[PDB]
Amino acid sequence: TVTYTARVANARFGGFSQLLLLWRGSIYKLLWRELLCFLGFYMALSAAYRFVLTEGQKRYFEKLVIYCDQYASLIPVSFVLGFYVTLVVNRWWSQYLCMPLPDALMCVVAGTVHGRDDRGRLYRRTLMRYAGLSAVLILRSVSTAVFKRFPTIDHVVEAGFMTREERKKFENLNSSYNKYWVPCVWFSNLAAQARREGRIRDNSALKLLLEELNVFRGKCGMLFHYDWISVPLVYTQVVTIALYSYFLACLIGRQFLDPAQGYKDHDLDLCVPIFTLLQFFFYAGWLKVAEQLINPFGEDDDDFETNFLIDRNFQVSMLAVDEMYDDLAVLEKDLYWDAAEARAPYTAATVFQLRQPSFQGSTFDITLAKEDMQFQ
């Protein structure tokens, strides 16, 4: 993931022009090879026309170039690219939102699974580790980087997400399908056992734990479904074919013809199609956005940092359920205990924000007449 939010916090005079100077996760990095190939083909055709063809061959080539230039209709390609890229971007954001996070489960566990002793610690840590293991299994199923990190269930066990006995049971389970749900069923069984033992003090807490677990498991399953059901191959091929057809038409009919021939719209020979190159840049980059976002779990610069997320989630959940459990600071009266109102201080760099009128509603400046305000 390439983050530039701090660079675009304010709308500045430089603005996106300064973003144009970034290399990592950039259009230049994604497209320079294709740009070189396009320019090489164009320059090869130009050199052939200038130095290889005879007079008759050059006349026929000029006729063909004029013919091809009339098919450079970029409105249909813009339509298809816009709709396809919008679909891909929305699917990309949905896939990111389908990533399983243990924050809700960890809050629920810290608030519902009790016991400061080793057995309570074991319950909380095991539940959080089951959630993390389900996330890791689905992520190694769907993400190339996570699979590289955990190429085998042996790697999963060594990482600490699964134990040896749990691995034995996991392998003994006879199933030909992805087993990312097995830790979720383990979580359900362990929550039921903890409720039966009294570690979970009420059926309402058990129901809350199971609801949060169902949310987490549903997110994992949504990740699996996004991995399985790809964006229609026919749609992807249609968009690629449209772009390639337009680029072929441009690369043929954008050749600089001889000015001496007196053709319409061909009287200046720049030897380098600056605007055709810019059009290729814009449209190929529009397609490269979809190319990069189509599988957001690869090793692109803008692809999701699933390994970092795994580490963060595991550490945070373990902290919340083990070290932060029942260690609240003693209840003490806060700063504004005797203050009727409450407003925190402003700094010298933000005090200007004050004196801005507090918004109360759009209708509090009407100032009607007296007789219009009288009830009937």
Part in contact with a second copy (CB under 8 A); list of ranges 41-49, 50-58, 152-160: 152-160
The yes or no reply on residue 46 touching a second copy (CB under 8 A) is no
Q: Can you spell out the DSSP letters for 88-128?
A: HHHHHHHHHHTS---HHHHHHHHHHB--SSHHHHHHHHHHH
* Inter-CA distances, 271 with 167, 256, 282, 283, Å: 66, 7, 21, 22
Q: Which of 55, 203, 260, 271 binds a second copy (CB under 8 A)?
A: 203
Judged by DSSP in three states, 74 sits in: helix
Amino acid identity at 215: V
Q: Scan for tokens 């954001």, then name that residue.
A: 93
In angstroms, the CA 190 to CA 370 distance is 69
Part in contact with Ca ion (CB under 5 A); list of ranges 158-166, 210-218, 220-228, 292-300: 292-300
Cβ pair 193, 150 in contact under 8 A = no
* Residue number with CB closer to Ca ion (30 or 213): 30
In angstroms, the CA 317 to CA 326 distance is 15
Q: Which residue is nearest to Ca ion (CB)?
A: 298
- Closest to 42 in 3D by CA, of 198, 250, 228: 250
The yes or no reply on residue 62 touching Ca ion (CB under 5 A) is no
Q: Which of 23, 298, 305, 346 binds Ca ion (CB under 5 A)?
A: 298
Part in contact with a second copy (CB under 8 A); list of ranges 41-49, 50-58, 134-142: 134-142
Q: Which of 50, 96, 153, 258 binds a second copy (CB under 8 A)?
A: 96
The yes or no reply on residue 59 touching a second copy (CB under 8 A) is no
Cβ pair 268, 259 in contact under 8 A = yes
In angstroms, the CA 4 to CA 14 distance is 14
Q: How far apart are the first and last CA of the chain?
A: 63
Query: Residue 365's binding partner, choosing from Ca ion, a second copy, none, with beta-carbon cut-off 5 to 8 A by kind?
Result: a second copy
The yes or no reply on residue 232 touching Ca ion (CB under 5 A) is no
Q: Which of 50, 236, 258, 263 binds a second copy (CB under 8 A)?
A: 236
- Closest to 206 in 3D by CA, of 219, 218, 194: 194
Q: Which of 46, 107, 153, 258 binds a second copy (CB under 8 A)?
A: 107
Binding mask 255-294 for a second copy (x = CB under 8 A): ----------x-xx-x----x--xx-xxx-xxxxx-xxxx
Question: How many residues in the shown chain lie near a second copy by CB under 8 A?
Answer: 229
Q: Which of 135, 191, 250, 257 binds a second copy (CB under 8 A)?
A: 191
* Residue number with CB closer to a second copy (48 or 319): 319
* Residue number with CB closer to a second copy (43 or 241): 241
The yes or no reply on residue 306 touching Ca ion (CB under 5 A) is no
Query: Residue 47's binding partner, choosing from a second copy, Ca ion, none, with beta-carbon cut-off 5 to 8 A by kind?
Result: none
Q: How far is CA 102 from the centre of its chain?
A: 19
Q: Site residues (CB under 5 A) for Ca ion? A: 295, 298, 300, 303
